Ligand SMILES: *[C@@H]1O[C@H](CO)[C@@H](O[C@@H]2O[C@H](CO)[C@@H](O)[C@H](O)[C@H]2NC(C)=O)[C@H](O[C@H]2O[C@@H](C)[C@@H](O)[C@@H](O)[C@@H]2O)[C@H]1NC(C)=O
Ligand SMILES: *[C@@H]1O[C@H](CO)[C@@H](O[C@H]2O[C@H](CO)[C@@H](O)[C@H](O)[C@H]2NC(C)=O)[C@H](O[C@@H]2O[C@@H](C)[C@@H](O)[C@@H](O)[C@@H]2O)[C@H]1NC(C)=O
């Protein structure tokens with residue numbers, strides 16, 4: 475069974491999407507993950523957007539795991555370079571029917587009290603204690619401390635194209651980040667065994683966060699906009 | 712140990728490179744692996760360019776294999792589309808002090824009567840027996856029949872940016888191909904154990920070939936230009 479969907483833009487009130495927390499779809503058809511009040515992003519914001527139907531990434535009966543490819547474009551504008559922008563966005567895969575975890579360096583996907591499994595690709599802008607220099611792309615499994623990391627220079631408010639491909643045969647998760655206007659390319663790959671970590675059915679989506687209050691910097695912020703999104707998955711069983 | 716070099720453009724008789732067969736460096740600072748007379752690519756051509764010094768991909772004493780990243784831009788101009796362009800170019804790693812193999816579908820890296828091992832990434836423009844639809848990026852290990860292959864649409868005469876990266880820890884070889892003018896991105900990856908196929912020291916370079924006489928089509932040709940090239944490898948021990 476193969477599943478696919480694509481959004482060249484988001485129409486206000488998408489019946490195909492589950493917006494959670496601060497996530498909204500602006501009038502101009504862009505999906506805003508964290509709050510932006512009148513052209514200016516706010517600190518203390520956290521939002522998620524999941525595809526509304528669970529996609530089966532593996533089947534017990536056959537043991538077969540799916541291969542998938544997801545491509546999307548996003549933009550992160552950092553108005554205030556002054557103290558430190560934060561926190562970044564992630565494309566994640568988690569069990570179905572979850573809720574926004576902790577904000578700040580957890581991007582809304584990790585809940586310190588009751589942790590649930592998840593595979594995520596992160597585009598990190600704030601250097602937390604467990605973090606290497608930022609910004610960096612990172613591969614997260616059940617945690618926010620990336621198994622693999624690679625730094626990237628941001629195209630401030632520019633467009634970024636992302637290709638995340640997973641080969642079930644090689645168990646390789648490869649992500650590419652291209653900033654078309656700069657012409658810069660960044661790649662990162664790691665071996666991930668979805669069958670070990672996540673359940674048969676999952677929800678795929680994005681989560682982003684702005685600076686946490688307990689950091690005190692009201693300028694610990696930026697936008698986390700996603701312009702388009704496509705995903706395709708093939709379970710041979 | 713760490714080794715790295717960068718070619719922003721090639722100069723005539725670059726001491727750092729070793730040209731072989733038809734390969735030459737034009738006055739315009741471009742590396743033409745295969746012959747092109749008066750702006751027209753010729754058939755029956757093969758050329759190689761290797762970096763003058765050997766690099767160490769692993770050490771037997773410690774058993775440490777090197778991680779590396781290489782980036783280059785190429786341009787393939789297919790003037791006569793009618794018959795069928797041939798054959799392509801490859802980035803390849805081989806034992807030191809080798810000689811140009813068989814042109815045509817072997818790109819000049821394979822010699823059927825005295826085979827040497829190699830790890831190469833190809834950009835295949837002509838479909839041989841052992842081939843799937845072309846053009847395609849393919850990961851070749853000791854053979855021209857790829858282990859992994861991904862189809863891609865060429866930007867005829869246009870520029871392509873390639874990023875090849877190998878992580879020793881995961882043994883992942885991930886390659887990215889981006890056509891800037893076209894805004895296209897293609898990604899392919901595969902687990903390759905350099906240690907299991909190559910010697911401690913190697914040569915890195917490119918190789919290209921136009922249509923072989925044994926095909927009669929004198930139009931089985933295209934250019935195989937290399938605009939720039941940067942390389943970096945790191946061996947812990
Ligand atoms: C950052 O955002 C949250 C959510 O907007 C603020 O709190 C309020 O949050 C609680 C949920 O824990 C909710 O029940 C309240 O209705 C909500 N109220 C308002 C007016 O925002 C959070 O902080 C603040 O904490 C609450 C308890 C309230 O005292 C408010 O005045 C205070 O600012 C925000 N923190 C900062 C520092 O902006
Ligand atoms: C090899 O390349 C030639 C140039 O691209 C092709 O020929 C010509 O192209 C078109 C027809 O496809 C004509 O409008 C041009 O006037 C031709 N130009 C020249 C310089 O030859 C050629 O295609 C073929 O050869 C031409 C001359 C005709 O006889 C066609 O029947 C034939 O397809 C191409 N070679 C081959 C073997 O396809």
Ligand SMILES: *[C@@H]1O[C@H](CO)[C@@H](O[C@@H]2O[C@H](CO)[C@@H](O)[C@H](O)[C@H]2NC(C)=O)[C@H](O)[C@H]1NC(C)=O
Pocket residue numbers: 755924
């Ligand atoms: C294809 O290419 C080869 C190399 O350019 C041609 O061959 C050569 O001709 C000279 C002069 O006789 C010899 O010294 C070379 O050593 C030859 N090379 C080989 C491999 O035989 C070859 O004839 C060309 N074929 C066609 C049809 O143009």
Ligand SMILES: *[C@@H]1O[C@H](CO)[C@@H](O[C@H]2O[C@H](CO)[C@@H](O)[C@H](O)[C@H]2NC(C)=O)[C@H](O)[C@H]1NC(C)=O
Pocket residue numbers: 553554555556557691693
């Ligand atoms: C947070 O960012 C602001 C805005 O960039 C910083 O404040 C000021 O910024 C410029 C340089 O400091 C001034 O020229 C601006 O006029 C002024 N902006 C405003 C709205 O007053 C501020 O210093 C930063 N805060 C911290 C803690 O670094």
Ligand SMILES: CO[C@H]1O[C@H](CO)[C@H](O)[C@H](O)[C@H]1O
Pocket residue numbers: 560561577578579580600602684685686687688689690691694
């Ligand atoms: C000091 O850290 C805390 O606040 C900053 C804001 O300055 C970041 O949000 C970070 O995620 C959070 O842990």
Ligand SMILES: CO[C@H]1O[C@H](CO)[C@H](O)[C@H](O)[C@H]1O
Pocket residue numbers: 797798815816817837839921922923924925926927928931
């Ligand atoms: C017919 O096959 C032979 O000629 C064609 C050109 O037409 C290619 O060069 C191919 O690699 C070679 O083996």
Ligand SMILES: [Ca+2]
Pocket residue numbers: 561579598599600601602605
């Ligand atoms: Ca962080």
Ligand SMILES: [Ca+2]
Pocket residue numbers: 798816835836837838839842
């Ligand atoms: Ca071929």
Ligand SMILES: [Mn+2]
Pocket residue numbers: 596598605606612618619620
């Ligand atoms: Mn991180």
Ligand SMILES: [Mn+2]
Pocket residue numbers: 833835841842843849855856857
């Ligand atoms: Mn091939």
